[PDB]
Amino acid sequence: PLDQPSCKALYDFEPENDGELGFREGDLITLTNQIDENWYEGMLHGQSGFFPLSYVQVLVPLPQ
């Protein structure tokens, strides 16, 4: 198994601007940073952006 930080989308998320990363329920998202208590940065299909913690479930956590 990979030790790359990652999470799985619980719900579809449509971005409100180009800073946000869109995704569909069930997508495996690469985690790259945690901005704050409520927001992550990550990657999907090579694209990068921010999205809410509340829309995802962590698989492999970022270092704390």
Side-chain angles (χ1 to χ4, degrees), residues 26-40:
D27 287 346
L28 284 22
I29 300 159
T30 299
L31 283 174
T32 63
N33 185 46
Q34 180 171 356
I35 299 294
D36 66 3
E37 292 88 353
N38 304 118
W39 290 89
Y40 277 132

Side-chain angles (χ1 to χ4, degrees), residues 16-28:
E16 290 314 295
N17 62 67
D18 300 317
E20 294 188 340
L21 178 69
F23 54 78
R24 314 305 288 167
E25 175 180 5
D27 287 346
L28 284 22

Side-chain angles (χ1 to χ4, degrees), residues 10 18 54:
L10 296 174
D18 300 317
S54 67

Side-chain angles (χ1 to χ4, degrees), residues 5-19:
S6 62
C7 62
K8 195 175 181 166
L10 296 174
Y11 326 102
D12 294 346
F13 178 65
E14 290 91 27
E16 290 314 295
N17 62 67
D18 300 317

